[PDB]
């Protein structure tokens, strides 16, 4: 309705959500529920393409996508992405209440998440910011005397941007920004969980301008969209998932350029040196945003000798303090999680860690088939190697807690994961902490605060098992963007006299 | 012998060369024959490393060899390159030889690659060009404000060098530099083909100060390769050969960094405004350099009208007015092709391409098991597209040659193969030259030059089948390197006052 | 009245603007008449500051401007900058008409101008482009083992902006822009002649935000502003004018940053290759418009012998079948010259090239006491150099044509004159464009258009007398902004292992 | 004698040094005596050269040097440049002794210098890193459709290096290896003091192969060099000096390109937080090295009052177990000032300290009319204003120390003196060295280290009195290079199709 207004099918009761096929709003394969991890609760249908839609789509992507992206100049693509800023804005109760009942998103996130939205089509242009190329003259070889060199950059053509459900509205307006920005035609496949804010944002971008033949948005599920990884039209996948999906997807992908966001947790640590007050705060909030259901939520917290006592004892208050339940009173803290079996997985690792050791803090406690509190596990430095909430990243509101004697142990500790997305680091001195900047596996660290990729202002990704590649405002155009080198010859040709 | 006095064994009349498994040259493997394309002799044979061996390897690559290269100041490292790069240069005439008897390759051009490798590592130097990162301040968007971000680059850690056949000693030593100078380990898998240039380059870096522990050679012929390229501990893997392999390789190694070099041939465009002259010999060596054992040989020349006469008639006359035979006399101008298979699937894609209207304008004879004329094939623009030398590489010293109208022609014939590697333009009106540079999809386009690598002086990749990423001086630190983003938080802290 | 409603004073008939002395308008040195070249007559008057003003101004930049220009943060610097784009743009038919009237300009042109300042305010964001900045790692050194640098901008501070006559509101809002987006404070003062459009930028930019202490604009004449360059707070001077004013700017300012852009006349040069139609257009423009008042007018033209005929008589007829008068017929095409001083200049200069050899080809006839018609004066080669027209920069719609052998005596005769801004070069191949991009000395080169800084998009500036440093979008600030440089020493603190 | 063998001239028992002509060693102007401030004795005399021969020699680099140095290719250029740095590296000992007797440096200060010479010249490889340029695409503005930018940097022709006494070796090769490797040449004017170890300079790289009429070596004193400054035909001066003569250099040079390092001294501030230790050692040698005639000398130390104490004390000691005499003994610390009117301005400053309620803690004594012993003076917040020392640079071994209640006070302190150029900050927290790195008012600021500018690995240049623009490795290049773009119109070719 209002937005989707002729797309939507209200059949049956519950309204059915066409994919676009880089044309029309249809399909004519399979039709799939969506429900609400707020009552389990059928709330809607969307109609996944078929074999043939598939190929037709990719077939209109490839032939007249490319260009209607690449031939639409840079200050027309420009002025599409701020409209569709606008419309998405004018309609923003409306995405929220979607993410709110879709995902499980608490009131105050799932308005965050939109304005995030917003925020990041407004400001394609500092994506600019990396625009340019570089002028190589050729007298610094006798070889390339009276030779020159012109590189820059040009868009692949069709890409791939494959989303998770944590955030389906922004990181589908993200990779749908990045990638036309620079002139790319882009198919999107958002989780089959929570399909609709993307079809909003779709729909909005078409609204405004965005050529109707160089983007797509099928409605596949899991392996459904292996099909579309695979074929050579595809020259770029941004794939932001499980370290699992995503190796999935290299394989049967083979060459093309990709940039996988595989999260896992973070690590944070605190040095004697912290600001308990500023470290309890963000840390506590690290650890239960969106019921944990962050790439970037704290999973470990490692604190030295001195501050170890106040700071657990600060967090496990605050965690405690919190309000679980419905997503819409904004007096609430933490929603539900996507789905039971997610509660399921927690609860089992909770008891892994204390049959291994170690003790509760704070929360523990299931309250429904999509429900837990927020849980903090004290862990003893030599047990905690071998706890499934180490070695694993369990997405839900919960994270370890770990006495260290110092930094080298600390750093230790956090590196002992197989993941490296990003880490935080609570303290003063400069010494121990340039020394953890150096020594943390992981894409990004923050000093001082929790971790938040926020709209990619500074750019995130990850190291080890988190992935490769990064996305952010002016770097993403590497993923999605190739090198084109122009080398003129001269010689003999009076241009220099010998030089 | 000499800079391999104590590695290589005398064993049966024939030098054996063994693996170098990061600390000790060694190997307990099965022993492979290395056979030379002059007379499919026998010259060496290669110890091949057991699975045990190659574990430990991996292992010490990556518990020692990470920290050994990354532990080293660049002041280092670079000393190390440039010591190597004298042992290789007083050892030339060694080298060459090698390079003469195990690739087939015609003494100049030996001395040449042996001149590149030199090169190459003396000016590593100019590698750090693309060091450095940015500072991006905080207070250009509300959230981010009393902010602050810090973006660098870091070692991945263990890169996997995988090597070609046409360029035994000058890919190995391209690939282990750029990885080294930016403090990564490598693992060298040469081709089991001419795997001796690349067992002469290390032990020079050995003896140069290359720590010991970070650098490996293991002879493994083709799938037992896999196994390396799978392993977790290989952060990155830079490969060089046919798409073919390339797909596999991504799809056995998963989520990595990748640089695929897959090369395919190059077309070569003439406009009426060229200077057939130097056209006509720069497209004539393109063609037959090496017996077109190149990733950048000219494969297709497409001239207009007014000019296609002249055009090929010079390059044909050239072609047959060449010297076949063996490498050694300064006087020959083509040896011959690595193996008699190579020059059966060149027969074969003649006889192709005659049956499909294509008429021999020079070459079409073979001379031996592995010898053969270089070949100039003339071909109808209505039937060319689906002859094997144009849908396919075919390495050897074949072009086919075609008459177009004009330009948009010649584009969308050059764009027609699957590959994208490089092109070349002849020709001076900027309009023209400038709308070919916009529509060639090839990672690079040379402008009145034949198609030529050289040491990557100017960044050199493909696009579409010819793979993804690029090789050259400064631009391969991309590869082997991961972004590392550090945000510090001073909010309400007093920096800045509302800033 | 309007926009400017309680600062103008009707008084005695005619508006009397005051200054603006950051904080408030006002002033009370002496009163100036401000006259339009379209008939002599004042059309208001603008009060200067006097001693006591203009140092207390300063004071106020200093003490506090600085700060509160740097204290605001660059998200909001631009939403600053944003408004007054909002605010111009309404006010658009009062802003052309001020120019029509004030400057002379024609209707269409006077709207140009004030749609470039619109879109130049508009697109501040784009100078964030060169916002960033670089690490160094300190390993490359022995010396700088175990140590790491930072190197980022700031702002200067207070930033003079002194403008001239040709372009009262585009070089004034340019000025501002860029002097602000980084956080500078800035004084602007404009050409005494048409001082009125900067006044209404100004007081736009107030009503939008820009901190009042923080801005400055004094109505001095001359070398009345000679104080204020000559101050130790003034910490930059961007200057706009001719040759001699800019030296005497440097030589009263001593040590200091400077961005000087002091024109000259341009250069454009026609290959036997060139479309003549284009060339013939394009040069006609280039040498007329805005009655030649544009340092980046073309006030020379090179031909080759075979098309030198058909240009210069394409030019010739173009010239002369343009419409002088008053500049508010939309029918009109050359209004009036800012002084009838400045048309004396030019009929001088016309019989001096006559004098020596020189013949007209187009115009040479006075029409007023500012009016006169485009004039194309031909010249043989080998008398050209000691025409006045050529020696120097007759402000005005006068060209000089001569016949070249070849691009040799183009780019010779090109670089004879004193000056150094742009040049233009019309033809089609690439080694005759690129000889002649190598040696003409000029800070920017047109390939087949006439010169056209418009809003810096594309950054300019000067060689020898035409100045020093560029404008354009990212490049200015480089001359508002100086380097800091941060150096951390970590040596034997244990953050790196020897490295 | 042997590097200057047939170029020196002994007559009269004292070595003449003649001046070089950009082609010959020569000079008929008035000769002057050098002396030695060791024992005030002559050492040498210098050629200056007479009106004509500077107007010939200017003549000669502006029509032949500009092209030599250009038209050089970088290659050469670097071998040349090389093949410098091996020849001053094995008359090591000869350039030092030179230093020592005519500098007054010590011994191993005089070796460090020459070392440093070398290491700029052979690292010139490293000033490439900023070589490059732009691409601009078009399509981001609607009246640049169609249209394309590139932009890179060029040599300006002549610069003029005009170089103090404290570094007579270093500055000059620095000056003459940044100038020349960018394709200019030069006009070197060394301190009429010390203009011994340039001569010596100079013909290294003559011998090296550098272009001989591309640089040239006049002996002129202080005023004298006026007429090289004013010229046309020096597009660029680079000035390392006094602030005084900085100023009188621009007033008479008018518009060109400046680098204007005018030194001063530098604060350094030490929080609680600091080693004491580290800060004291740094400190110390920061106030006495070569005499405190370093321009990055420490003049004035702010401690907090927690380690105040102690970090005076600990200075004081390593301040007065210092020897002073003769710069031979490697035992002896301290040499001689350049002048005894150095010495005298010393002893005046120390007195007004006394007078103003300064007391001395060590030093004070003046040992002969060129010896004084390294001094510290403890003053009090509230009258060291006032004091010369503080309101001056006195150019001598001498520093003021005050206590501060915190930060802010010992920011604004450090900012109080009428210079900028570096600063050191001694302490650990990272907020508050974050905001002394964002408030002090400097070039460069040290973290945990003295100041010390080496050869320029990091970029340093003034702020305020201290002068504009940066040199270092790199950096340099803005300053002797000038930026050109070339815009090329391809409106309705067909390059695009709208966009
Ligand atoms: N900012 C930095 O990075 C830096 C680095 C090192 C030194 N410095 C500063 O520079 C000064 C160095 O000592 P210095 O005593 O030799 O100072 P200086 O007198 O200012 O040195 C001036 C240089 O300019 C020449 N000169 C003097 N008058 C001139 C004129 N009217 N026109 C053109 N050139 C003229 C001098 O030649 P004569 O010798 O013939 O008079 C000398 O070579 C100190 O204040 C120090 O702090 C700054
Ligand atoms: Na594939
Ligand atoms: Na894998
Ligand atoms: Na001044
Ligand atoms: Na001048």
């Given at each position: ?134 002028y190589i003259p050729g007298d610094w070889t006798y070889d390339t005397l009276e030779t020159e060199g ?337 080398v003129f010859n001269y010689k003999?040709?009076?241009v220099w006299k010998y030089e």
């Amino acid at each position: 309705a209002g937005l989707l207004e002729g797309v939507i099918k209200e059949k049956g009761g519950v309204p059915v959500y066409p994919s676009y096929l880089a044309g029309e709003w249809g399909g004519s394969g399979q039709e799939i529920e969506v429900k609400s991890p707020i009552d389990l609760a059928t709330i809607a249908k969307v109609i996944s393409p078929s074999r043939e839609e598939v190929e037709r789509t990719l077939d209109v992507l490839f032939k007249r996508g490319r260009w209607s992206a690449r031939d639409m100049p840079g200050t027309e693509r420009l002025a599409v992405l701020r409209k569709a800023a606008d419309i998405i804005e004018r309609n923003l109760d409306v995405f929220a209440e979607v993410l709110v009942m879709n995902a499980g998103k608490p009131k105050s996130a799932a308005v965050g998440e939109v304005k995030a939205a917003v925020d990041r089509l407004r400001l394609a242009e500092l994506d600019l910011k990396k625009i340019g190329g570089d002028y190589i003259p050729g007298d610094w070889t006798y070889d390339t005397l009276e030779t020159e060199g012109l590189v820059r950059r040009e868009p692949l053509g069709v890409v791939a941007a494959i989303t998770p459900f944590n955030y389906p509205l922004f990181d589908a307006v993200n990779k749908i920004t990045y990638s036309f920005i620079y002139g790319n035609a882009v198919v999107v496949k958002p989780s089959i969980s929570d399909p609709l804010p993307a079809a909003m944002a779709v729909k909005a971008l078409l609204d405004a301008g965005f050529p109707p033949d160089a983007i797509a948005l099928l409605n596949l599920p899991g392996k459904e969209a292996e099909k579309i990884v695979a074929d050579d039209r595809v020259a770029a996948v941004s794939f932001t998932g499980s370290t699992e999906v995503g190796e999935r997807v290299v394989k049967v992908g083979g060459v093309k350029q990709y940039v996988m966001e595989l999260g896992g947790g973070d690590p944070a640590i605190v040095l004697e040196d912290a600001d308990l007050d500023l470290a309890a705060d963000k840390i506590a909030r690290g650890i239960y945003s969106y019921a944990g259901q962050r790439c970037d939520a704290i999973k470990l917290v490692l604190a030295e000798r001195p501050v170890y006592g106040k700071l657990v004892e600060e967090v496990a208050k605050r965690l405690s303090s919190l309000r679980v339940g419905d997503p819409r009173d904004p007096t609430v803290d933490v929603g539900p999680l996507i789905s039971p079996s997610a509660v399921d997985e927690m609860m089992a690792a909770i008891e892994d860690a204390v049959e291994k050791g170690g003790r509760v803090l704070a929360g523990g406690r299931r309250l429904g088939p999509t429900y837990v509190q927020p849980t903090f596990v004290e862990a003893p430095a030599d047990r905690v190697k071998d706890m499934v909430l180490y070695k694993r990243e369990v997405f839900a509101p919960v994270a370890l807690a770990v006495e260290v004697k110092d930094l080298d142990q600390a750093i230790e500790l956090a590196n002992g994961r197989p993941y490296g997305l990003d880490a935080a680091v609570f303290g003063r001195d400069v010494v121990k902490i340039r020394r953890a900047v150096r020594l943390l596996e992981v894409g990004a660290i923050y000093i001082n605060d929790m971790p938040r990729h926020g709209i990619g202002y500074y750019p995130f990704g990850g190291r080890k098992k988190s992935g490769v590649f990064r996305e952010g405002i002016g770097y993403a155009v590497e993923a999605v963007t190739a090198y084109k080198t122009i080398v003129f010859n001269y010689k003999g040709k009076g241009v220099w006299k010998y030089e």
